[PDB]
Design a protein around this ligand. Structure first.
Ligand code: HEM
Ligand code: HEM
Ligand SMILES: CNCc1cc(C#N)cc(OCc2ccc3c(C)cc(N)nc3c2)c1
Ligand SMILES: CNCc1cc(C#N)cc(OCc2ccc3c(C)cc(N)nc3c2)c1
Ligand SMILES: C[C@H](O)[C@H](O)[C@H]1CNc2nc(N)[nH]c(=O)c2N1
Ligand SMILES: C[C@H](O)[C@H](O)[C@H]1CNc2nc(N)[nH]c(=O)c2N1
Ligand SMILES: [Zn+2]
Lengths: 404, 405
């Protein structure tokens, strides 16, 4: 029945009863667990039941279940689906749903912040040009001169027999990755494909390691359009180390704003194929994954050599030492520039508080241990020793196929 | 595509499919509705006979005599034996194969590249706690080999119907005492408070150091457990020092050479070996990160960080990460200097990737528990972080079992 959940550092035990509210299967079966897999392998009645469940969630949230307005709204949704095969959300429902989808995201360690989310309604958008304007305003609001504010902008929902609104870029701000003839890559290797799409769609490329990409924005059944972001809108933090002077000379930097733009937002059965959302960075995303992954900037060996570490053997722990200093430079640099950032210790400590809040509030919290535990110093954080239960609740953020 | 889990390595972009999972005869804790993969400890002659037949089939495949007259005769012999006694018995070569297969099958072990090289000591003739002690001492001496460690397992008699189990009460053959103090704190290893108190209840004169080696509490069938002190010359330890931080040696830290787990159950063909201690050599993060830095273990992080003169009043100094790295380095350097076998988390995980490739060819997959395989510091700096894994139960298996008391 209900899973018993133990924290092995504290010996404390909870029971997840929230998982009973899941209506979608994940990838595991009794025969085998597939929890470490990154991506999933792959009528009106279904829509209506999801819509009803969501409207119920909404009215429960404002403490008006069974009220006159609740009953009426359910009738509206019914009548609209029955006549048109679909329906539309009111702005307040949309705001509630967006917050819930963040709240429900099992891979997000940042969910203590979930109720604080600025929601821009961009559902009255009819062109790529219009999308660009909203995106620019989103970035301006969210960046806020370094005092970062979580935000989401929601473009029109998918409709049957019509192409989707899509942002082709995986994030609103990304660095170009240029493939050199000698097989190597200049810039960010994770972005080679989008970089090439941009050029093919008319972009005049740079040739640096940190060239901010233009956006490819797509209105339904139209070819994507290219828009260069005004450089003053894109706040960036040059990286230096608090004690190691040669570090600044590495010419490293990162953008302030993590804004994911290729995920699908699902609310009450309705799907929003373009709904980019941003918060602020946890230092390890930059210092560990983006800069140290072998298939990203891969700077570990460079930094270790500048530290005069013995790269001959793994047993010198040169990689571990370099990684720590790189993460330190990220924290120092962001703090020096007055740009919001949170280290992995403070973040995971906030997440434990969040688990506790959610236990009292809903009787559980879906969480993906492999993603919640940071990529360095895992067991040095409280989340490592916390058992977690992973399941899919809706409203939800989902992966969706690439539009090309 | 193929009707089997598809497994991707995100560093290299390479793809495999796990077909081995189809062989799993036992359910784990997950369902389509919720994944419970992070949970540490998740919850009949014909049942015996089917497990027995499956194992005998595995054995004869492994020697390429599947379908042979000897295969069919051994099957007949196991059925006869279960029919007239309710149980059966493994031949020596079957026991050796089963023990190795149990190790090969262990999803949480990063050290499985070595699975073929395991010295199996058959102790199924043991009939007293005294004799268990002799077997255990011999195991330790062989496995320790003055620092050139050798993987080994010693197998004591199986569970028998209407007869008490052989049990080793201790969780490992070598463990440090944990003494609860009057102020509520613990001196030594807090993990070992209960066993320490049990040893005292059974007549042990306790010490009062941070690193007192515990005596062994050994139990022969239907007998009270008896106490046995390990002769200190048999327990190899390594004092911890740091290659450049000269003060680290003054901390007086140390650890033992031999990780020898003694409270797990070896299951083979439905037979249950309740006492079957097994040993290898350490991966350095087990000592340097978990045993020494866990808040509920020795918890030395702040002490080290203070000696290093770090700012422990704020998380953003990364004092915890810095201290933890130097502690791990001290473990590695000290074991290396002492010429005692040890492997760092980088070399270990790299060897595990080799093991995955070996097993992909040999068996079409490898059961692996991602959360346990990925080391507790520097996770994404190791290749296994970026490797998707499929987790399932295969038998022969090592299993958790309830404590005898
Ligand atoms: C406010 C500060 C925030 C912090 C510190 C934070 C932290 C993180 C981190 C560290 C990850 C793992 C990322 C990775 O390894 O690639 C993550 C994932 C995620 N975050 Fe948050 N986040 C924040 C805000 C938000 C907001 C505002 C939303 C949505 C409204 C959100 C939704 C998500 C989702 C859906 C994922 C999983 C993405 C995936 O499955 O690939 N986060 N977050
Ligand atoms: C030869 C060197 C070996 C290395 C470097 C090694 C490494 C490891 C590590 C790091 C763990 C995780 C332990 C923890 O976090 O508590 C582990 C677990 C495990 N090892 Fe290995 N190991 C070795 C040999 C062996 C041998 C010889 C056996 C059995 C014959 C074995 C069976 C197991 C089992 C069953 C577990 C998981 C136990 C559980 O589920 O709690 N290992 N090993
Ligand atoms: C699984 N492949 C990688 C990946 C794919 C997709 C997709 N499609 C989305 C991904 O989101 C990572 C993410 C998303 C939002 C974040 C926010 C708001 C803040 C923050 N600090 N970090 C964040 C990280 C990651
Ligand atoms: C105590 N933490 C949970 C725990 C419980 C039980 C039980 N019941 C067993 C456990 O085995 C960890 C283990 C086992 C064998 C190892 C070998 C041979 C070598 C090595 N380097 N490390 C090893 C670690 C761990
Ligand atoms: C194979 C594994 O699931 C994959 O590398 C995951 C592991 N954990 C992660 N955790 C976070 N936060 N982000 C990631 O991209 C990943 N990648
Ligand atoms: C909650 C979580 O499952 C638990 O802390 C696990 C995580 N991964 C681990 N991995 C290893 N190797 N050993 C452990 O004890 C643990 N503990
Ligand atoms: Zn699972």
């Amino acid at each position: 029945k209900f899973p018993r959940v133990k924290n092995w550092e504290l010996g404390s035990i909870t029971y997840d009863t929230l998982c009973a509210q899941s209506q979608q299967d994940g990838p595991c079966t009794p025969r085998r667990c597939l929890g470490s897999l990154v991506l999933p392998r792959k009528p009106a009645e279904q829509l209506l039941s999801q819509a009803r469940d969501f409207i119920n969630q909404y009215y429960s949230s404002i403490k008006r279940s069974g009220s006159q307005a609740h009953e009426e709204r359910l009738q509206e949704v019914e009548a609209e689906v029955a006549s048109t095969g679909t329906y539309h959300l009111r702005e307040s429902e949309l705001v509630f749903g967006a917050k819930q989808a963040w709240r429900n995201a099992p891979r997000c360690v940042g969910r203590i912040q979930w109720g604080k989310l600025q929601v821009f309604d961009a559902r009255d958008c009819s062109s790529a040009q219009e999308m660009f304007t909203y995106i620019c305003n989103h970035i301006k609001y969210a960046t806020n001169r370094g005092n970062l504010r979580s935000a989401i902008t929601v473009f029109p929902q998918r409709a049957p027999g019509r192409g989707d609104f899509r942002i082709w870029n995986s994030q609103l701000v990304r660095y170009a990755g240029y493939r050199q003839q000698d097989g190597s890559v200049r810039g960010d290797p994770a972005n080679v494909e989008i970089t090439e799409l941009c050029i093919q769609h008319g972009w005049t490329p740079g040739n640096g390691r940190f060239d901010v990409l233009p956006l490819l924005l797509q209105a339904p059944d139209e070819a994507p359009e290219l828009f260069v972001l005004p450089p003053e809108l894109v706040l960036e933090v040059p990286l230096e180390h608090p004690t190691l002077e040669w570090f600044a000379a590495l010419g490293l930097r990162w953008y302030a704003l993590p804004a994911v733009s290729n995920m699908l937002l699902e609310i009450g059965g309705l799907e929003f194929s373009a709904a980019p959302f941003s918060g602020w960075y946890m230092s390890t995303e930059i210092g560990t994954r983006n800069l140290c992954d072998p298939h990203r900037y891969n700077i570990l060996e460079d930094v270790a050599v500048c530290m005069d570490l013995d790269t001959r053997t793994t047993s010198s722990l040169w990689k571990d030492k370099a990684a720590v200093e790189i993460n330190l430079a990220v924290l120092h640099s962001f703090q020096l520039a007055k740009v919001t950032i949170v280290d992995h210790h403070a973040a995971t400590v906030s997440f434990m508080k969040h688990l506790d809040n959610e236990q009292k509030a809903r009787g559980g919290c879906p969480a993906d241990w492999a993603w919640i535990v940071p990529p360095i110093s895992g067991s040095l954080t409280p989340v490592f020793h916390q058992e977690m239960v992973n399941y899919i609740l809706s409203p939800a953020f989902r992966y969706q196929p690439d539009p090309w």
